[PDB]
Design a protein around this nucleic acid. Structure first.
Lengths: 197, 194, 197, 195
DNA sequence: TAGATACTCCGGAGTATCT
DNA sequence: AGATACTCCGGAGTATCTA
């Protein structure tokens, strides 16, 4: 809808300059409207952050979730989903770096009630996403395919691993689904397989 | 002394809230004086950032550059390197969080854009050595033969983002830290499924 | 049109007090609105200094350019050009001051990359305009009219010296065009002619 | 041996020329001389003091090293041509000091110090008085042409001053070579273009 | 859309006290 | 005799609101 036009606009500017440096008129001329359309559709500057958070975080789930019931060993099964995770990062890059930031801004802001409720739901529904990988690494060492390492560290770092890719990856904007998934092929196995022999 | 007291109080403060929402007097009550002595030593709020970015990295290349010519193979030196790298990240995570966060990002003096750039590609010198020991780690290969250009930029990036989940387990000795950095690099260098 | 009125007041204010003593509120007062109007049309304080500086370069070029492409010798072109150059100083005295103190403190003061570059993106328009006065002083130094003297310093001197009229010039409000043209012709004979014969 | 206050004013004057009067701060003047703010404020009562201390010395430099060419023998042109030379040399050795002279009350100022700026601006017109005479002593003398001696004074010293637009520095040449660089310019301003 | 209003936070001059 | 530190304050900029 029209809201997504601002959501698409704010996302890229949110990576380039963060939250506070991103001013409301810094994203007003970018989409091509005065400050009213931002305030007609979004009651506050924090609301834009949450709506982008509430969209992109479902974007990730809706694109990885069906890879959890498909059959395979926990290395074969999880590699299948986590390839599609780097896929989602690279296609809708705007909605994927916003999920790194967050609680940093809740501290600095004197929060309204509605954002504090919406933030909380997103606060654990990311944790529930962590449960998926916390769930489907278990089958990795339950079907005997992964290094028998700590059940928490393997989860915490690998999601920390997968998301840190947006430090160097800028864009291609023309990268077909082949080069997207085939760049996603060598980066998951780089982390999954490691560097050892 | 007095300056070093401010740099610490500024470093963790920049980590805790971010350069944008860390007011000058917000970092002045941690040291116990008024903004007067915070601005007396550093002419700008951006100059403090450059005084942390230049010590935080100077304190990380004093552990991991020593492990460039040492008793080890490709992995046995790279593991020794990445332990002492992720070591200081674990001890002074305040001084760490500025560098890789403060990359994508404003008004800037002539002596500041270059001074930030002359420090933002000194971080490329840190990256230069890690690609140098992955090539050394492939000729005398104890590690896999994947492409250099991207695998060099991943593991270092993978190992700077340890802080997103990493707490501060209070009471750590020198022994706790190096072992705490042990299983994470073996998580990361050795990887999984091996 | 209001943006021009902001530039008109800004050029008046910027000339009289400078850049520093010119506060955002001052331009708002001389236009007749609050601080918000000034920021509704411009991203920053400096982003209007380019607007005054960029517009002022058009004004002279729109009215001084034909006199370089006109019949006559090197003397007959400078006089037709230099008079019209002073006809701009003596009419829009505000705009013409902005193109003096724009290069000096550029290093010593902060600017965004899209602003400091936009500064020197217009600072060629000074040199690309001084090119016209190097192109026609040229066609006199060897082609008859102008005294044989180095092409470079004669362009440094003349331009810096018919631009130094703002030191003493004071616009008598209620001015007429034929009065200003007469005063311009007076000074030029002082400048191109000299004092010898 | 060295002079503390002189090192402050020489460093401050060039600071005023580059950044401006506002863009240079008090600690900015503490860096070029390599000192602390308290040294500035134990010697100078305020930052406006700095500006009247270089203005007072800019004149004593400008007014003194150019006066002996209004009394030197020669016509009104012979005086003026050599008079403008020692003025250009002066600007080109005292870039900060001379640029202050044409860098002049829109706010309430301290009376004791205000009463010196307006006076200092009266040694100002006192300087262009000599330019007023030698031009008038030359226009109908014959060495110069017929010109509005008011205009010929306004537009000439403002022109001889207009050099600091492009002249940065050399600091490799000396009096003999700086004589050449000023010579071509006064020959421009005095001689003209068309012949 | 067009501005007005509130308000913060950065930086600088000036002053007070200590070195 | 300067240094160090503090205090006061201006004003640029940005968020929210109101016509």
């Amino acid at each position: 809808d029209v809201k997504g036009r601002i959501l698409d606009a704010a996302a890229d500017a949110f990576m380039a300059r963060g939250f506070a440096n991103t001013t409301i008129d810094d994203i007003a001329d970018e989409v091509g409207a005065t400050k009213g359309l931002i305030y007609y559709h979004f009651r506050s500057k924090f609301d834009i952050f949450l709506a982008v958070y509430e969209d992109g975080m479902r974007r990730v789930r809706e694109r990885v979730e069906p890879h959890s019931t498909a059959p395979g060993t926990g290395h074969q099964r999880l590699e299948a989903m986590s390839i599609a995770h780097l896929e989602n990062l690279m296609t809708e890059l705007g909605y994927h770096h916003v999920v790194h930031q967050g609680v940093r801004h809740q501290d600095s802001t004197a929060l309204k009630v509605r954002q504090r409720d919406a933030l909380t739901a997103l606060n654990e529904l990311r944790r529930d996403y962590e449960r998926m990988f916390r769930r489907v690494i278990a089958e990795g060492i339950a079907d005997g395919s992964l290094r028998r390492v700590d059940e928490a560290l393997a989860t915490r770092t690998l999601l920390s691993n997968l998301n840190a890719v947006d430090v160097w990856y800028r864009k291609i904007e023309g990268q077909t689904g082949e080069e997207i998934r085939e760049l996603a092929s060598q980066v998951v196995d780089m982390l999954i397989g490691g560097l050892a022999d």
